[model samples]
Target: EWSLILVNRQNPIPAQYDVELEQLSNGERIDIRISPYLQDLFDAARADGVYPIVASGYRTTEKQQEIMDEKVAEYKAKGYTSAQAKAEAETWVAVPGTSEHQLGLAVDINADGIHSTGNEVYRWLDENSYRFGFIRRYPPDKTEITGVSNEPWHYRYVGIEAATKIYHQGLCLEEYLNTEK
Candidate 1:
């Protein structure tokens, strides 16, 4: 399924990639197939007294471009040259289409409008999200391979089987996928 499709700095999503979606109450969209599972994951977290809010969800390529452009602009305003700005921006934002958010299976969670890290919400996800078919997409230790910073709030739905193996093995998605071959 597309849920396992990899989208990263090195893998740009194809222009025709299927993106069937469902909307959240706040207007954010996610792949329709995963909506129920995502909601269940959220509900289960809440049931355990860990409040997790979906800070961000599926994004169109155009929106991804805007986000990247905004970051580049911020860097440019800080006196960086065009080239320097782009380089710096990429470190913070994914190049459009290369982000997992474009796949409708990635989400950024928060706690009371703040990042989930250093809080019980994050600890809950770290301990239980795998049971709900999610994984901390960018863990602190996988920054080098992921080409992204540690985003404790970002989770990717990879299904229970793969997520469980990944969690137990202490492996990133890239590592898990690579080992399959």
Candidate 2:
């Protein structure tokens, strides 16, 4: 139930939501309750010869603003108007309080690159992460439902049974939440 909490443009974060963070060796932080599950997943990934890296974890308020700005700039550079780019960036970067990173429940994971390629890491996670209680938050076909582009590297804690069901049903979190009730 705890990991099932959702945050998005419409939902923001629940007022009662609070968290204790556990910092990883790379200085990234995640909700403390999820730390062990993630660690076990990481260990299993390494054992399977995938060297994954937590490219991003919890975002400070300042960092979230900076990331949003950078994403907007990337779109603006592609010739989008300021307003257009800002709206476009919102697809990939959640607005401050609405970010799962702020809730410390999601991570943008990548490969170490030398030992394992990004595709390799992603494939491994796609196949095995549900067993560890994590799910690929934005699958390629779920962009409309997710309000985000396909993000092969982003994973979220949703608990084992829920993740398994979502995986087997070919559903995203938004879809799962909608149909479950």
Candidate 3:
């Protein structure tokens, strides 16, 4: 049952998120943008024989709104009240402007041999991506800040300098960046 969780607005969802369109796997598309560093990470990882592809990326506001609407309905139909649906969805879906995908900085990584979230290459990426400026946006222990659950495949590229600082601080992006500003 998805519950309605209030999103904190002050943070002003990350920037690379709101791209002015990108292709979606389902054939449907959206007008979204992404961080250039993210593109590089994917390219570099793939070059290492990972075949890691982005399952999701920059989502236009309209597309995000549409997906939210559909998920809300789906959850409602599955015996969840609207509030419950919203809360549950919060864990998986980004609420429009709050979505990292919109910034183009966040992405859901997918691979071939290791299809599930448990792929070996995925593990390697998890450990090494930050070296390239990509961090798992919603780490298991960072739900309070990410406002989402643990999603091993999700990544956000904040640049090498930012990533290094966040790594050194052992802080999640939201907390680390907020500390700076």
State the lDDT of candidate 1 residue by residue for 119-143, as single tens digits. 7878888899999899999999998
Where model 1 places Cα greater than 4 Å from the true spot, the runs are 77-79, 113-118
Top model number, TM-score: 2
lDDT of 3 by residue, 43-123 (tens): 777676666766777677898888888888888999999999988876777677777655555667777556433475568
Give residue 12's error in model 2 in angstroms: 0.2
Give the poorly placed runs of model 2, Cα more than 4 Å off.
none
Task: List TM-scores for all candidates, in order.
Answer: 0.91, 0.97, 0.73
Per-model CA lDDT versus the true structure: 0.86, 0.93, 0.66
- Tell me how many residue pairs clash in candidate 1: 0
The parts of candidate 3 lying over 4 Å away from their true place are: 1-9, 13-36, 113-118
Q: Which 10 consecutive positions of candidate 1 have the poorest summed lDDT?
A: 110-119
TM-score of 2: 0.97
6 Cα displacement, candidate 3 (Å): 17
> Between prediction 1 and prediction 3, which has the larger lDDT?
1
Candidate 2 displacement at residue 115 in angstroms = 0.3
Which numbered prediction scores highest in lDDT against the true structure? Answer: 2
Clashing pairs in 1: none
Ranking by TM-score: 2, 1, 3
lDDT of 2 by residue, 47-131 (tens): 9999999999988778999999999999999999999999999999998888889889999999998999999999999999999
